[PDB]
C-alpha cells in the first residue's frame, strides 16, 4: 500500500477533501456524491451498480504496479529516468487524476496541483499540448510571426500574458487578439510555466516583446522595434509569475513603451518571445550575462542577431495585435512621444 503512504510522497498526491476521499474509497454505497450540492439532486442521482468493489480491485492492481515502479525508481540514478519512472508510478492514481482534472492548472494551488511533482508536470504538459500549444502555433503561423521574427519555434513552455495595471480588469490575452491602446497602455505581466526537467537553481530566462511592423520610409518597407526587454530572470515550477515584484532595474534592458500605431499604417503585431540562457557547468550560481546597451538598437532591432550573439534558445511565445484608435494620441502624450504620423488610405 504505497499510495496510502506519505512519508516521502508529496502531500499533493491526495484529495484534500475528506468527503470526496471517503466517497471515492467508500466500502458500501451508503454515502452520496459531494459534487451534487443539492440534496434533491443527490436523491435523484443513482450511481452505476456494482462499481465500488470493481473500483477497489482495480485500485489494488494499479497500486501494485505503482509500487513496482517506485521500487525501480528508488534505484535508478539518471535524473531523466528517475522522473520518467515517477511519472509512470503516479500517472494512474485516482487522486492525482481527480486533482488535475477538476482543479485549476494555470493559477494552480500548491496543495492540489504541485508542479514540483513529475506526474503533475507531465499531466500539465499533456493538457497544454492538447489545446493551448496548437492554438499558439496556428496563430503564429497564420499571422506570419515565425518567419518575420524568428525562423521557427519548438514550444516547450506555456506563456500567458496579462495587462493588470492598465485598466483593472483581469483577463489572460488570447493569442492574436486585438487590444485597445488603453488596454495595452501600461505594462504586460508574464507567466512562464515550464514542464521539462530544468535546474531551477541555475537557469535564467529572458523575455523580448518586438513589433516587426513599424513602417520605414527610407526603403518603403517595414522594420522591427524592441517594445520590451528583460534579462536574467529566474522562475520556479510553482512561482513563475513575472511582474515588477520579481525583477529589478538591472534586469530591464529596454523599459516598456506602449503599442502606438499610426493612422492607416496597418495592423501591427506585437510578439513575445521567451528564451533560456546558456547553462554553464563546473560553476556555482546562476550565470548572468551583460547586454551591450550601447549596441542595442531599440528602434532598428535585429532579433536573430541578438539571439545568435547571446546564444539564446526560444522555448515559448505569445502574440497580440494593435491598430490605431482615438486613445493613441493620449498615450503618446502620456509617454512623451512625438505626435503620430498620418499615412494615406490607398497603397499606391
Amino acid at each position: 500500500h504505497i499510495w496510502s503512504d506519505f512519508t516521502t510522497r508529496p502531500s499533493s498526491l491526495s484529495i484534500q477533501s475528506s468527503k470526496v476521499k471517503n466517497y471515492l474509497f467508500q466500502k458500501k454505497a451508503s454515502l452520496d456524491p459531494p459534487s451534487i450540492s443539492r440534496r434533491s439532486n443527490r436523491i435523484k442521482y443513482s450511481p452505476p451498480e456494482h462499481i465500488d468493489e470493481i473500483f477497489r480491485m482495480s485500485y489494488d492492481f494499479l497500486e501494485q504496479r505503482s509500487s513496482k515502479f517506485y521500487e525501480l525508481a528508488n534505484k535508478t540514478k539518471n535524473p531523466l529516468k528517475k522522473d520518467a519512472l515517477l511519472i509512470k508510478a503516479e500517472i494512474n492514481n485516482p487522486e492525482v487524476q481527480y486533482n488535475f482534472q477538476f482543479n485549476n492548472k494555470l493559477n494552480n494551488v500548491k496543495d492540489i496541483i504541485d508542479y514540483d511533482v513529475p506526474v503533475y508536470r507531465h499531466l500539465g504538459k499533456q493538457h497544454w499540448e492538447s489545446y493551448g500549444q496548437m492554438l499558439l502555433m496556428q496563430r503564429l503561423e497564420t499571422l506570419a510571426a515565425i518567419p518575420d521574427t524568428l525562423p521557427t519555434l519548438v514550444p516547450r513552455a506555456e506563456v500567458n500574458i496579462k495587462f493588470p495595471f492598465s485598466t483593472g480588469v483581469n483577463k489572460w490575452i488570447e493569442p492574436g487578439e486585438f487590444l485597445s491602446s488603453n488596454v495595452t497602455s501600461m505594462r504586460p505581466i508574464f507567466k512562464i510555466q515550464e514542464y521539462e526537467l530544468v535546474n531551477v537553481e541555475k537557469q535564467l530566462y529572458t523575455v523580448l516583446i518586438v513589433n516587426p511592423d513599424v513602417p520605414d520610409l527610407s526603403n518603403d518597407s517595414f522594420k522591427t522595434a524592441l517594445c520590451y526587454g528583460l534579462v536574467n530572470i529566474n522562475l520556479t515550477y510553482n512561482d513563475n509569475l513575472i511582474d515588477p515584484r520579481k525583477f529589478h532595474s538591472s534586469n530591464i534592458i529596454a523599459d516598456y513603451l506602449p503599442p502606438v500605431p499610426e493612422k492607416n499604417a496597418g495592423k501591427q503585431r506585437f510578439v513575445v518571445w521567451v528564451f533560456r540562457q546558456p547553462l554553464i557547468e563546473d560553476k556555482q550560481g546562476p550565470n548572468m550575462l551583460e547586454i551591450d546597451r550601447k549596441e542595442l538598437s531599440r528602434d532598428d532591432f535585429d532579433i536573430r542577431q541578438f539571439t545568435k550573439k547571446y546564444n539564446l534558445t526560444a522555448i515559448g511565445a505569445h502574440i497580440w495585435r494593435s491598430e490605431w484608435d482615438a486613445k493613441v494620441a493620449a498615450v503618446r502624450e502620456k509617454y512623451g512621444l512625438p505626435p503620430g504620423r498620418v499615412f494615406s488610405r490607398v497603397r499606391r
Partner: protein
C-alpha cells in the same frame, strides 16, 4: 469565386494542428467513442467469448506448428515493372503493369509467432432480386439480418441498370451487415452448431472457394435461414425468408490457411482443393 486553384501554404513548424480541438463546435464529438462521456458510448466487453478463448488457448499453437516451414522466405507478389533505361523516352514514363495482372498483388511472409491466421470479420450479403417489384422485402431482409446477427443492418441500393433483369438504379434491393468480435463469434457458433447440421444435404464448403488472399465465402437459402432460433420461435412472423451470402475475412496470407482455421472452428470441407 475569383478562382479554382487549390494550393496549400507551407508551414514553419513541426507541431501537428487538428482543428477539431480548436473549434468550440461539436463538444461531444471530441470524446472518443470509448469514453463514458461520449453519447456514442457502448460497452464492449460484457462477457467471455468461447470461440475466441478456444482459438487463443488451442488453435494458435497448432496453427503455428502446422504452418511452420524451415528457413522459409518471403515470396514477393506481382508488382509494377520498371522500364529499362536503354531509351531516353523511358525517363518519365509511368511504370508497367504487373506481368499477368492489371492490379498489384501482396507478398506472402512466412508464418511466425506474430502473424498466425485468425478471423477478422464476417460480412453477410442479402440481395433480394424480387425486391425490384416490392420495396418492403428489403425491410423484411434487414429484419432477418438483425434477428439472426443482432447488429444494425445497412441497406443495399441498386447501382446498375440491367433491362433483361428489370433492375433499375437507386432502389433498395436488400441489406448487409458486418460482424466483429463476440458478435461474429456468436454468429459462427450458432451457424455451425444449429443451422448447418439442419440442412438437407450438406457436405461442407467448397475447397475451391474464396479470394486468393484469405477469405472464404458460402451461401444459404431461405429454407436454411428458417433453421435459426429466432425464425423458428416465431414462424408466424416469417411468411417469407431470404437467403444470403456469408463472407469470412481472416488474417490468412493464403486461402488454405484460412480453410485450416475454419476447420478448427468446425466448418466442413468437401470439394477437391486447388
Amino acid at each position: 469565386p475569383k478562382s479554382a486553384c487549390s494550393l496549400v501554404k507551407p508551414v514553419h513548424h513541426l507541431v501537428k494542428i487538428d482543428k477539431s480541438k480548436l473549434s468550440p463546435r461539436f463538444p461531444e464529438l471530441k470524446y472518443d467513442k470509448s469514453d463514458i462521456r461520449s453519447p456514442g458510448f457502448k460497452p464492449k466487453d460484457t462477457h467471455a467469448d468461447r470461440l475466441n478463448d478456444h482459438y487463443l488457448n488451442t488453435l494458435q499453437s497448432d496453427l503455428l506448428l502446422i504452418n511452420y516451414s524451415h528457413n522459409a522466405a518471403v515470396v514477393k507478389g506481382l508488382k509494377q515493372r520498371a522500364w529499362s533505361g536503354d531509351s531516353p523516352y523511358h525517363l518519365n514514363r509511368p511504370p508497367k503493369n504487373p506481368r499477368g495482372s492489371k492490379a498489384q498483388l501482396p507478398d506472402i511472409h512466412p508464418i511466425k509467432w506474430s502473424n498466425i491466421p485468425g478471423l477478422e470479420s464476417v460480412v453477410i450479403n442479402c440481395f433480394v432480386r424480387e425486391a425490384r417489384e416490392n420495396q418492403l422485402l428489403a425491410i423484411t431482409a434487414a429484419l432477418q439480418l438483425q434477428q439472426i446477427t443482432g447488429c444494425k443492418p445497412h441497406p443495399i441500393f441498386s447501382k446498375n441498370d440491367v433491362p433483361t433483369w428489370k433492375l433499375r438504379k437507386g432502389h433498395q434491393m436488400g441489406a448487409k451487415v458486418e460482424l466483429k468480435g463476440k458478435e461474429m463469434s456468436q454468429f459462427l457458433s450458432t451457424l455451425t452448431e444449429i443451422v448447418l447440421p439442419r440442412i438437407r444435404e450438406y457436405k461442407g464448403i467448397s475447397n475451391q472457394s474464396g479470394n486468393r488472399f484469405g477469405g472464404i465465402s458460402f451461401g444459404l437459402t431461405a429454407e436454411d435461414i428458417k433453421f435459426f432460433p429466432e425464425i423458428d420461435a416465431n414462424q408466424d412472423s416469417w411468411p417469407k425468408t431470404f437467403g444470403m451470402h456469408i463472407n469470412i475475412n481472416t488474417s490468412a496470407q493464403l486461402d488454405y490457411q484460412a480453410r485450416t482455421l475454419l476447420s478448427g472452428f468446425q466448418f466442413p470441407f468437401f470439394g477437391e482443393e486447388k
